[PDB]
Design a protein around this ligand. Structure first.
Ligand SMILES: CC(=O)N[C@@H]1[C@@H](NC(C)=O)[C@@H](OP(=O)(O)OP(=O)(O)OC[C@H]2O[C@@H](n3ccc(=O)[nH]c3=O)[C@H](O)[C@@H]2O)OC[C@@H]1OCc1c(COP(=O)(O)O)cnc(C)c1O
Ligand SMILES: CC(=O)N[C@@H]1[C@@H](NC(C)=O)[C@@H](OP(=O)(O)OP(=O)(O)OC[C@H]2O[C@@H](n3ccc(=O)[nH]c3=O)[C@H](O)[C@@H]2O)OC[C@@H]1OCc1c(COP(=O)(O)O)cnc(C)c1O
Lengths: 370, 371
């Protein structure tokens, strides 16, 4: 099977994990602390904190910003369900705004309209744009819009570590950036994530919330908190991969260019559309959109039988019945709905070569012919 | 240093972790599924779910029971701060009740009185007894009290996997049992935990909440949820240790009796009191209480200089200034406060032998002579 991902953890990292298990510290230790330092340096951001997973990162960002009951946060229609779920979990309401069809990211015009029209009853406190599939498109616009309207911005950069727009590293534009180290995420720790910020007060708050409100001095419990700590052995894995991330992103960009060339016939005859792999895109996922006449579920099944793993890219929040703020049924979300219904992620990861891309395109061509 | 714990992960499990990293599934997979089945069998409970940590287990239990804003949960005064924190995190109020001097567990008579006096304004929905340091004392009474008063019971069994009272395994008495696999917890996965229950509807709810509301026609998102999944390689570690747990607990109980014997001279002259290591205690921590005349922080430091790791056992919730419900401001908590201020955990783990216990007792005797 040509898979959506197939992370290769360096053997020296496996050996380090074994050493840690055999005779090292298991909870967050030197490996996690060094990983944080190295992540911060990589991003050019003041602070990083590693955490249990990318959902945990978003959760902690919301909590550190005192977003909760009585509040609202804008999310894109097209994203993984965690983005909207985690807003609701802290007691806030997820306010859905459509994405644009080119980038698959929160549409800045529709975002402006939502903010402009907002009059409560909840207090609109934040935007949570997703840099979907590694696409940084609109990063700086989101920052500008948040600043214009006095909103916090939490980047859901789950799939976008290493991406950048116009000199701004994704995750670093405003209050918080949140990353995932799920096995689809290029840098993986099995489960894992990170919260980054340039604001030391926010860093200190997240550090408390991550581990029971504990401040080292002996230990003082400063506030109520959670446990979202990453193990030291997970940290070891991640920091072993980080020095390779740029090379892996470069490889993914080359593979994407191969897809762009090989898929042009299918585009020209109208059977699908391509993602727009802009400068700074980290190519975490390569999602096409099939023409309406194809049943996407049947295409996935047929590709599986031809040893190609494919899937939808992400969900349409408005389609799920979970985010029932009044705003969310005042208009339709045609772009996110199209991407949810017709989107098709094709394998693209650093373990593939150009021949593997040709294999996938051959299989897809065959399936869409018959 | 003789340490509070020193987990020995079997080499075969390290090899399995390596195999998983090299060529296996990293997210919750067959190892986690088998671990759940084996945990449930070990406990004689219908269902188990492994999760990121013991705090996550408590969190999910609260959420699955719809405990949140407007509600209240009773917690013991003496516990790790997570117990009371996680109640507050879901929007409920932690209502503190003192512990027993002897067992260090929630005092059933003081529990009864708190429930009797409760008249709001919040809705009192649950008790969250802690089986502290692996002590099962009062497990069945907590169940009986919860049933008598129409309350849910969530066992904070973070430190008590393998403990039992009167034939009931800790974690299995009522709605939920919550365990930790932190490195002090005998069975460790570095970080990890488990939620257990006999109620299939509660099981299904927690499984949804643990992974984004996902139900596997294809995936449906049934409800809003979190990510508290344990990795497949953490699951592999935990299920490798579980078959050893009873033997490790038996070893710990042997060591506890060595402490009891050797510490007797200090007890006799009033320098400290001992824990009561009852039948069914899993001996996750061995916590003494120093006499008031000792500065515990100084004892800890002196012991460290003599290659003995020691610490307080747990915190006093009423002492922290975090749990400010009216009830907690009016009630007094002398027992939990004493255990917080004067408790001293001494190393006790399955990697120690009798010689090591003697070493610790020698060092403590020396320190308390020169204090
Ligand atoms: C774009 C993408 O990668 N989405 C993933 C999402 N998948 C779908 C179909 O929705 C969903 O993945 P999942 O459905 O669980 O798995 P999958 O998409 O079917 O991937 C399976 C494939 O991935 C590979 N894989 C697998 C395991 C593993 O251990 N070895 C491995 O190789 C292998 O090829 C598998 O067949 O969640 C992860 C990813 O999303 C998480 C996420 C989050 C939350 O972050 P975390 O809490 O850290 O997860 C926030 N915010 C955004 C915008 C997010 O995208
Ligand atoms: C009794 C006990 O073991 N308490 C731990 C608690 N410690 C203190 C002093 O409060 C506290 O530990 P900590 O203060 O961080 O560390 P420590 O007590 O000083 O232990 C350090 C020693 O432990 C050993 N250790 C360490 C790492 C590690 O990787 N290798 C290792 O060997 C080693 O000897 C270290 O020096 O948290 C864990 C434990 O409590 C968690 C817990 C929870 C929450 O569960 P989780 O979310 O899974 O944690 C709920 N509910 C209850 C009733 C709980 O007790």
């Amino acid at each position: 099977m040509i898979k959506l991902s197939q992370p290769q953890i360096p053997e020296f990292a496996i050996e380090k994990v074994a050493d840690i298990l055999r005779g090292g510290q298991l909870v967050h230790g030197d490996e996690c602390n060094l990983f944080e330092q190295e992540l911060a340096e990589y991003l050019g951001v003041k602070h990083a904190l590693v955490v249990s997973n990318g959902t945990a990162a978003l959760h902690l960002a919301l909590l550190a910003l005192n977003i909760g009951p009585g509040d609202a946060v804008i999310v894109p229609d097209f994203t993984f369900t965690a983005t909207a779920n985690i807003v609701e979990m802290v007691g806030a309401k997820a306010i859905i705004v459509d994405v644009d069809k080119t980038s698959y990211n929160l549409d800045p015009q529709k975002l402006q309209a939502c903010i402009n029209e907002w009059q409560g009853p909840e207090t609109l406190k934040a935007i949570m744009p997703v840099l979907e599939f590694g696409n940084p498109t609109h990063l700086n616009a989101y920052r500008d819009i948040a600043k214009q309207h006095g909103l916090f911005m939490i980047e859901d950069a789950a799939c976008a570590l290493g991406a950048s727009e116009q000199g701004t590293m994704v995750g670093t534009a405003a209050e918080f950036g949140c990353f995932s180290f799920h096995p689809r995420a290029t840098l993986t720790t099995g489960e894992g994530g990170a919260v980054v910020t340039n604001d030391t007060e926010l860093y200190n708050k997240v550090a408390l919330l991550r581990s029971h409100g504990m401040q080292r001095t002996g230990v003082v419990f400063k506030c109520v908190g959670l446990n979202y700590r990453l193990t030291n052995f997970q940290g070891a894995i991640g920091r072993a991969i980080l020095p390779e991330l740029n090379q892996w992103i470069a490889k993914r960009r080359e593979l994407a260019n191969q897809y762009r060339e090989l898929l042009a016939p299918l585009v020209e005859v109208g059977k699908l559309t391509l993602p727009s792999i802009v400068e700074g895109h980290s190519v975490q996922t390569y999602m096409t959109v099939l023409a309406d006449n194809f049943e996407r579920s049947d295409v996935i099944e047929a590709l599986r039988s031809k040893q190609v793993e494919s899937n939808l890219g992400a969900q349409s929040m408005s389609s799920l019945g979970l985010f029932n703020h009044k705003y969310n049924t005042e208009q339709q979300y045609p772009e996110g709905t199209r991407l949810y219904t017709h989107g098709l992620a094709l394998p693209l990861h650093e373990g593939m070569n150009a021949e593997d891309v040709a294999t996938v395109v051959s299989a897809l061509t065959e399936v869409l012919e018959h």
